């Protein structure tokens with residue numbers, strides 16, 4: 001019955017911030033038919049057509065439709081400087097082509113402030129205690145947070161999604177749970193944050209009794 | 210054709226004596242040709258007849274929204290009774306049925322901890338007071354920061370997040386002028402939840418060497 005639908009995805013945050021990763025924008029076409037699987041993708045960067053996108057392997061979904069996907073590698077600095085990426089999709093089951101445009105969220109970046117907070121004394125009655133990392137004042141909301149100890153990632157932590165604050169920046173908390181004895185024995189735990197507005201896109205704060 | 214949504218009561222409505230909780234059966238995209246909607250309601254399988262239909266509302270897109278509300282007893286909802294709405298309309302080939310109840314699972318009492326601002330935050334104009342609320346089930350909860358009985362103007366509370374033990378946690382961040390912390394004013398984090406004694410608890414935070 002219904003024709004295809006198009007969704008355009010930004011790079012993953014870590015891909016935009018890590019030297020070792022390659023960020024890409026992903027143009028996804030769903031509900032493509034078996035009678036007309038062919039999809040034309042045209043790509044534009046700030047309105048200028050580009051030709052280095054690549055089509056991923058066509059994929060039949062469990063519901064017997066085709067998913068057709070084009071990916072365009074982006075330069076780290078291009079994405080972070082706010083370039084606009086446009087995908088134009090044509091298919092014979094569409095009456096007209098579909099255009100979508102994506103870019104990094106607009107707004108002046110702001111550096112996260114990272115504060116480690118020890119467990120409350122009242123939590124010391126429990127088997128495990130909570131080590132809290134408050135990350136606030138950041139913009140845009142794309143960010144990565146990890147808790148580590150002795151250079152290894154901790155097994156049991158959860159990070160809230162960024163939440164808009166009253167000044168137009170974002171904040172989050174990351175809660176690390178550890179056995180009480182590991183806190184009491186004086187081990188050092190570290191909260192690591194990646195964000196475009198940090199120096200070298202990275203900072204780390206440590207916490208210990 | 211029309212679509213049917215069934216909403217539970219507001220969390221505060223379920224926990225406050227002074228409030229009346231209700232379940233709301235919402236029918237959208239009702240036509241002008243056949244605005245008539247029949248509602249049947251059932252409580253644990255047993256038809257009831259004390260629901261009320263809200264005033265019909267034409268929406269900005271020129272469709273009708275038709276809503277039936279059924280009042281629920283505080284104890285009935287917390288004891289997990291199940292509420293079914295059956296909807297009939299000429300533009301439906303078959304009636305639509307929807308059931309809703311308190312989320313299944315044994316309740317667990319929130320643990321509430323207040324965490325003072327980091328010393329590293331003391332060069333800022335304003336400091337962050339943190340309320341960690343963890344280990345609670347189900348996720349329905351309300352949180353508020355106060356001082357001298359009056360609610361605070363500038364706090365934000367994260368949505369509940371599922372933790373690794375199947376309970377929820379959240380943080381509530383209160384922002385105050387540094388001078389109000391430095392001068393020893395007392396702030397309080399108040400939490401309402403079904404598994405608290407009297408459905409309420411309060412924890413204070415202040416600078417007090």
Ligand SMILES: *[C@@H]1O[C@H](CO)[C@@H](O[C@@H]2O[C@H](CO)[C@@H](O[C@@H]3O[C@H](CO)[C@@H](O)[C@H](O)[C@@H]3O)[C@H](O)[C@H]2NC(C)=O)[C@H](O)[C@H]1NC(C)=O
Nearest residue numbers: 002005007008009028029030031061062063064065066067
């Ligand atoms: C057949 O199966 C595929 C795979 O499950 C379905 O594809 C999915 O289609 C929905 C839209 O109908 C897409 O939802 C979109 O997701 C994005 C990302 O969260 C969101 O931004 C959009 O607002 C929207 O929710 C979903 O991405 C897509 N999943 C995949 C893997 O491509 C397809 O709809 C099914 N077709 C039929 C007729 O059932």
Ligand SMILES: *[C@@H]1O[C@H](CO)[C@@H](O[C@@H]2O[C@H](CO)[C@@H](O[C@@H]3O[C@H](CO)[C@@H](O)[C@H](O)[C@@H]3O)[C@H](O)[C@H]2NC(C)=O)[C@H](O)[C@H]1NC(C)=O
Nearest residue numbers: 212214215216235236237238239268269270271272273274
């Ligand atoms: C015409 O305007 C009305 C009112 O703006 C639109 O009603 C909305 O319809 C959508 C689904 O079509 C409803 O979304 C649902 O919301 C619930 C709770 O947020 C969610 O659980 C569901 O999965 C879904 O997202 C939405 O509740 C409803 N809004 C209101 C005020 O009733 C309607 O869609 C428009 N109809 C047409 C033909 O344009």
